[PDB]
C-alpha cells in the first residue's frame, strides 16, 4: 500500500534543541523561521536546485528547509509489473509523453503532483503504475 502523502522522511543531523532553519522562497530563501525538536518530519515537495542548493518542505510555502541539514529516507517508486513491462513518464504532471522505464529500477519519490510522481530527472509517472514506500 503506497504513502499516501509525502515523499519522505527528514531528521534533522545536528542535536535536539539545535535550530534548523526554515525559509519561503526556495530559489531566494527568506528566513521564515527555526525548528529547534529534533523528531522526524514528513517532507511533502523538493526544490531541486542542485548540490547545496536542493530544499525540502516540511510543510507549506514557509516550510522550506535545506537538505544538506538532514538525512532525508526518500519514499521509494517501484512499478508494479514485471521487469520488461514497459511504464511510461512524461514531462510534468498530464503532460508530454517523454519515454518509459522497465521496471527493473527502483527509483526516489522527488516530487508528487496530481496523481503522478517524479522518479528523478523531470520523469513524471502516473501513480496507479507504481507502489511508493516507506523502502
Known sequence: VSEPEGIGVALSIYPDGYGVNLYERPSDPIYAGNITKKIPYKVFAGYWGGGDKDMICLGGEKQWA????????????????????????????????????????????????????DIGGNRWIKEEHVTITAK
Do not use: C, M, Q
Open 66 to 117: 535545506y537538505n544538506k541539514h538532514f538525512t532525508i529516507d526518500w519514499y521509494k517508486v517501484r512499478s508494479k509489473y514485471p521487469v520488461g513491462w514497459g511504464v511510461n513518464f512524461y514531462d510534468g504532471p498530464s503532460g508530454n509523453f517523454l519515454g518509459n522505464i522497465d521496471g527493473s529500477e527502483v527509483y526516489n519519490a522527488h516530487n508528487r503532483v496530481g496523481g503522478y510522481v
